[PDB]
From a paper:
We successfully isolated stable complexes of RRAS2 and MRAS with PI3Kα using gel-filtration chromatography, reflecting their higher affinity. The RRAS2-Q36A mutant exhibited a twofold increase in binding affinity for PI3Kα, while the MRAS-Q35A mutant displayed comparable affinity to wild-type MRAS. Crystallization of KRAS-Q25A, RRAS2-Q36A, and MRAS-Q35A with p110α (105-1068) resulted in crystals of RRAS2-p110α and MRAS-p110α complexes, enabling structure determination at 3.1 Å and 2.75 Å, respectively. Despite similar p110α binding affinities, the MRAS-Q36A mutant formed better-diffracting crystals than WT-MRAS, possibly due to reduced conformational flexibility or altered surface properties. The rα1-rα2 loop and rα2 helix adopt distinct conformations in the p110α complexes with different RAS GTPases, driven by residue variations Y38 in RRAS2, and its equivalents, I37 in MRAS and H27 in KRAS. While the switch-I region and β2-strand are closely aligned across the RAS proteins, these specific interactions cause KRAS to rotate by ~3 degrees and MRAS by ~6 degrees relative to RRAS2, emphasizing the structural adaptations from isoform-specific RAS-p110α interactions. In MRAS and RRAS2 complexes, the guanidinium group of R230 forms salt-bridge and H-bond interactions with D42 of RRAS2 and D41/D43 of MRAS, respectively. Notably, as R63 in RRAS2 is not conserved in MRAS (I62) and KRAS (L52), p110α residue D203 engages uniquely across the three structures by forming hydrogen bonds with R63 in RRAS2 and H53 in MRAS, and van der Waals interactions with R41 of KRAS. Overall, interactions between RAS and p110α-RBD extend beyond the switch-I and include residues in the interswitch and switch-II regions. Structural analysis shows that RRAS2-p110α and MRAS-p110α complexes have more H-bonds and salt-bridges at the interface than KRAS-p110α complex due to non-conserved interface residues in RAS GTPases, providing a rationale for the higher affinity binding of RRAS2 and MRAS with p110α compared to KRAS.
RAS proteins cycle between inactive GDP-bound and active GTP-bound states. Mutations in RAS and PI3Kα are major drivers of human cancer. Their interaction plays a crucial role in activating PI3Kα and amplifying the PI3K-AKT-mTOR pathway. Active RAS interaction with p110α, along with phosphorylated receptor tyrosine kinases (RTK) interaction with p85, activates PI3Kα, allowing it to modify its lipid substrate, phosphatidylinositol-4,5-bisphosphate (PIP2), to phosphatidylinositol 3,4,5-trisphosphate (PIP3).
Author numbering:
A (entry chain A): 106 to 310, 324 to 345, 353 to 410, 417 to 502, 523 to 864, 873 to 940, 949 to 1054
B (entry chain B): 3 to 178
């Protein structure tokens, strides 16, 4: 077709790793019907970037990186002078990047346009203008310039309160001064390229279930490539068994044949829309051991009941032998055809069998209708407050269902009510569709629970995704983006409402779209999801606009780092580190490598540009698997005001997904403590998995490990190390930042059960901020206390101390842990829901619901708040051999 | 501007400190823009840059206009560490500005942690002798007290040693 589309097709294939021609060959009508029906999400998003073309295109490339609430915590407001911050405005005066400055003092709640108004007042002092003259120059220029953070590519393009922007509020909490500069709108708008999205060439191309009077019967035929054995089946509605599992005959592997129909204890019309068949080939010698599993939806994406013969390539069983079936696993045939197959037949009736339309569901729900405060209210309140992992007895399930009409006064109980509905029947599921049709919207953090593997009903998903379209801000969307992308695997079909919601947001926010692309590209090696995500990236790359060119320059940059680290481990592995360096400096000084690793955007933060790299600072670290320490220069004119050298660790060979999740949880826990009034400074540094055990680690500056600090000067060495780098006046600010950072990681590592901390796992900054880096494995491997707080840390917490304990400094450190512990315990449902959405990932420590139960122990969810505190006080006393008695 | 020959010019971080209403801003605006400012705009911390030739030797001047309202009693440690020279400025019509002269002297000497540092005492607002409250001899005695050069300026339309005060501080640094 169009030679411009051929050029676009080659760039899209380079970003996603596979050519677009392979998608044109997929004969699956769902794959082709997705590539066409998804293009209107691209049209609607491009139309938003063109509505008010000057400002909207700028709002897309440089979205306002702001927080969710304009209001500030009380301890944050008290860090202000009469609620006013001092900002420092810079300006270039000579064509040699010489910069002057002038400081303003303005209210925190002011529009950036008002900051520019105060800037004109300060600058026009040598102009000798009258009161009326000052109004002219303001209203002539107030609104023709934009504030920009000095150092990076962050802008202030929207009328948000200045303190709501993340950079400004981060300055407030850290006690620093904002360094901003002015830039004319026309100079920023002229640098915005025009987006040119065109519809691709492929854009141009019964009986009701409730009339079938019979039971569900599925025929198992034979099995090839199996290399005795039986087949175990089951009908699940997303982890909940709809009927009892039945087993085939016990046949030997000589001639794998069954040729038998299996009658299930389920009426055909009573099957739900999200009904699935979960089967497996099991062995038996007693010793029942699974050999291969497989799942298939009883309905296709057109609401058609399955009928006819079909082969199902099974999947290899992962590590650990659980129940013989695997409902939580993905549904669909294995792309690798070497795996054992399984031939099946589904019962044909007369013609096509469709799921009844929504209007027919309303008819049955109206008919089955014709067929409070003393404790009923409190019990419904107590049922809702329980964690999603807590069991719900059968009596409570009927009690919720009986009061399902009163449950609309507390819409947060909806997840508990959906689990109480017997999905095996159709009279109840028909009524449940009517409630969900008019159920009051819930908080977005709560609606995310309705998107894990325990809720597959499409009408239920539609309620959660609609709750996100109203309440989920772009700030929180980027916070939970890793979970929202993982639950895309739990979707029964390619075309659903969650994928259209994430795609439209990624195409109207480049900061969202950036990490959207990389999370999908990272899992592209996994053939289980390589087609669901590959088709999603194609639609994104075809409509993201100019950013695709930036992504390609990032893909080629990471590709060259992978190739180099691959040759380094195969050719010069056992060689000494000197020999490896000579090989490194040679393969990097070549022109093709220098052009690919210079002049692209940082994947850890696209606002940070990466100009020329300082090869003399690039080194192979003395850690495990030879990580690459890379150092770029900041090409910003005012780079000195933020940072001059951008340092990133490229780690090849280790799965960094566990670090991403732990760092994401640390960031979320810090935001919990901060908004309550607990100033505990955590350091959730950047970490982005970019593929199969390859990723990037953000380097924090002026930080040193305990083992490095110990060698730079035995027990009091750490205490003296801070007094040398913090004067007698800053000493109290350094030990304070040290105690508050320890209380956070002491509580965070205990709840999550991270890897054991040692002198190389713990790092300290010059100012006294402490944090961890390793994060081997979370949850389970008498609860484990990874952060033991050795006597070296106790000396710093209690300053000059005879016994460290029985000191007000230590007593105030114990209070910081108790308040932080009960703060995270009050939000237990959130973290449990964040772990639940990660089960579909390849996380070896997040496969079953038993691993998520670890935080239920460390948080003591079954005990009262008084008892849960005494619990935490015991493991600290046991791990420290005293100091936490107080009895 | 004025394009300087050679390259890598010396840069002098001259810091102007003194109480409020003394005239630190008006002196700096006069030296950089050749204009007197009569209005009341309390300064938090502003910087000014210029290339000028002093004693036939080009140099870059980074002049920092500090605060005086004492509300910003911080930030002092910053410019009192990176500053190459200091300009102690007091007002001859404000007695309170004269007592704080040695208040800034012990700060600069302690923060620098040296026996002495390039400083110049500036008696400003001498154009208002009808309300002058500090004689020339009182400024001379304070200047010889801390072994500091002395100069009387007035940022008013008559120039009066505005450029000389800065240029002398650049001279002190070159011969310190
Ligand atoms: N007559 C006269 N007025 C002067 C002179 N120098 C400064 N002033 C006046 O003194 C007032 C304050 O001057 P300013 O330069 O703001 O003083 P400052 O020492 O910078 N104060 P702050 O540190 O609070 O900004 C203004 O009214 C200004 O016009 C001078 O030489 N003569
Ligand atoms: C072993 C390693 C690659 N690693 N493995 C899993 N996580 C990490 C990891 C994560 N960070 C770091 N290491 C890190 C290291 C060094 C560093 O500064 C250097 C100068 C130092 N003090 O020697 C600053 C750092 O910043 C925190 C982020
Ligand atoms: Mg001033």
């Amino acid at each position: 077709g169009n030679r411009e589309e051929k050029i676009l097709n080659r760039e899209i294939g380079f970003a996603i790793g596979m050519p677009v021609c392979e998608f044109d060959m997929v004969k699956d009508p769902e794959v082709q019907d997705f590539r066409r029906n998804i293009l209107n999400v691209c049209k609607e998003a491009v139309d938003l970037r063109d509505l008010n073309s000057p400002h909207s295109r700028a709002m897309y490339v440089y979205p306002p990186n702001v927080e969710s609430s304009p209001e500030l915590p009380k301890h944050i407001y008290n860090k202000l002078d009469k609620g006013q911050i001092i900002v420092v405005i810079w300006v270039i005066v000579s064509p040699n990047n010489d910069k002057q400055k002038y400081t303003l003092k303005i209210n925190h709640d002011c529009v950036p346009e008002q900051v520019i108004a105060e800037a004109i007042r300060k600058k026009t002092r040598s102009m000798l203008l009258s009161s009326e003259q000052l109004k002219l120059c303001v209203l002539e220029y107030q609104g023709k310039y934009i504030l920009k953070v000095c150092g990076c590519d962050e802008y202030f393009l929207e009328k948000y309160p200045l303190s709501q922007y993340k950079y400004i509020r981060s300055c407030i909490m850290l006690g620093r001064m904002p360094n901003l500069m002015l830039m004319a709108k026309e100079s920023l708008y002229s640098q915005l390229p025009m987006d040119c999205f065109t519809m691709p060439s492929y854009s141009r191309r019964t009986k009701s279930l409730w009339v079938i009077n019979s039971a569900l019967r599925i025929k198992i035929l034979c099995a090839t490539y199996v290399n005795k054995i039986y087949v175990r089946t089951g009908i699940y509605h997303g982890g909940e068994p709809l009927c009892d599992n039945v087993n085939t005959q016990r046949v030997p592997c000589s001639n794998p044949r069954w040729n038998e129909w299996l009658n299930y204890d389920i009426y055909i019309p009573d099957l739900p829309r999200a009904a699935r068949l979960c089967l497996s080939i099991c062995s038996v010698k007693e010793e029942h051991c699974p050999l291969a599993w497989g799942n298939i939806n009883l309905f296709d994406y057109t609401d058609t009941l399955v009928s006819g013969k079909m082969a199902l390539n099974l999947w290899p069983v992962p590590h650990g032998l659980e129940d013989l079936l695997n409902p939580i696993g993905v549904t669909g045939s294995n792309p690798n055809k070497e795996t054992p197959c399984l031939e099946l037949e589904f019962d044909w009736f007369s013609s096509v069998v469709k799921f009844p339309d929504m209007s027919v569901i309303e008819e049955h729900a109206n008919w089955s209708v014709s067929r409070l405060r003393e404790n009923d209210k409190e019990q419904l309140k107590a049922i809702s407050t329980r964690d999603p992992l807590s069991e719900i007895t059968e009596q409570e399930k009927d009690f919720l269902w009986s009061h399902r009409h009163y449950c609309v006064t507390i819409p947060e109980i909806l997840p508990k009510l959906l689990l109480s509905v017997k999905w095996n029947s159709r009279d109840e599921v028909a009524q449940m569709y009517c409630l969900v049709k008019d159920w009051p919207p819930i908080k977005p953090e709560q609606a995310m629970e309705l998107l894990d593997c325990n809720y597959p009903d499409p009408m239920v998903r539609g309620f959660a995704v609609r709750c996100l379209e109203k309440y989920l801000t772009d700030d929180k969307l980027s916070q939970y983006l890793i979970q929202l992308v993982q639950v895309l695997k739990y979707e029964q079909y390619l075309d659903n409402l969650l994928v259209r919601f994430l795609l439209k947001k990624a195409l109207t926010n480049q900061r969202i779209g950036h990490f959207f692309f990389w999370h999908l590209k990272s899992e592209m090696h996994n053939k289980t999801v390589s087609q669901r995500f590959g088709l999603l990236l194609e639609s994104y790359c075809r409509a993201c606009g100019m950013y695709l060119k930036h992504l390609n320059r990032q893909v080629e940059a990471m590709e060259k780092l992978i190739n180099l680290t691959d040759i380094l481990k195969q050719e010069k592995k056992d060689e000494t580190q000197k020999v490896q360096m000579k090989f490194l400096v040679e393969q990097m000084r070549r022109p093709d490598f220098m052009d690919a690793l210079q002049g692209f955007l940082s994947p850890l933060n696209p606002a940070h540009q990466l100009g020329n790299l300082r090869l003399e600072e690039c080194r192979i670290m003395s850690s495990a698997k030879r990580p690459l320490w890379l150092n770029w220069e900041n090409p910003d004119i005012m780079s000195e005001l933020l940072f001059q050298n951008n340092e990133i660790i490229f780690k090849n060979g280790d799965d960094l997904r566990q670090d991403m999740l732990t760092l994401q949880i640390i960031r979320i826990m810090e935001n919990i403590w901060q908004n309550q009034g607990l100033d505990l400074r955590m350091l959730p540094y950047g970490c982005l998995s970019i593929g199969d055990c390859v990723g990037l680690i953000e380097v924090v500056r002026n930080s040193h490990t305990i083992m490095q600090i110990q060698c730079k000067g035995n027990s009091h060495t750490l205490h003296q190390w801070l007094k040398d780098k913090n004067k007698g006046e800053i000493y109290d600010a350094a030990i304070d930042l040290f105690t508050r950072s320890c209380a956070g990681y002491c509580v965070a590592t205990f709840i999550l059960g991270i890897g054991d901390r040692h002198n190389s796992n713990i790092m300290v900054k010059d100012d006294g901020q402490l944090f961890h880096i390793d994060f081997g494995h979370f949850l389970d491997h008498r609860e484990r206390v990874p952060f033991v707080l050795t006597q070296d840390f106790l000396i710093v917490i209690s300053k000059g101390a005879q016994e460290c304990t029985k000191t007000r400094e230590f007593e105030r450190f114990q209070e910081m842990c108790y308040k932080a512990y009960l703060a995270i315990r009050q939000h237990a449902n959130l973290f449990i829901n964040l772990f639940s959405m990660m089960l579909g990932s390849g996380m070896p420590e997040l496969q079953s619901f038993d691993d998520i139960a670890y935080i239920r122990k460390t948080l003591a969810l079954d005990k009262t708040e008084q008892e849960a505190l005494e619990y935490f006080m015991k493991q600290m006393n046991d791990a420290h051999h005293g100091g936490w008695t107080t009895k | 501007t004025s394009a300087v020959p050679s390259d890598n010019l010396p840069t002098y971080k001259l810091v102007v400190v003194g109480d409020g209403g003394v005239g630190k801003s008006a002196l700096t605006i006069q030296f950089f823009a050749k204009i007197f400012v009569p209005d009341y705009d309390p300064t938090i911390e502003d910087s000014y840059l210029k290339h000028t030739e002093i004693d036939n030797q080009w140099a870059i001047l980074d002049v920092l206009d500090t605060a005086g309202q004492e509300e910003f009693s911080a930030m002092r440690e910053q410019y009192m560490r990176t500053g190459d020279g200091f300009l102690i400025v007091y007002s001859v019509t404000d007695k309170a500005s004269f007592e704080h002269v040695d208040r800034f002297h012990q700060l600069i000497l302690r923060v620098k942690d040296r026996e002495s540092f390039p400083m110049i005492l500036v008696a400003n607002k001498v154009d208002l002798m009808h309300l002058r409250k500090i004689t020339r001899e009182q400024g001379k005695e304070m200047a010889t007290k801390h072994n500091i050069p002395y100069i009387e300026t007035s940022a008013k339309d008559p120039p009066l040693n505005v450029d000389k005060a800065f240029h002398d501080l650049v001279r002190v640094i070159r011969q310190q």
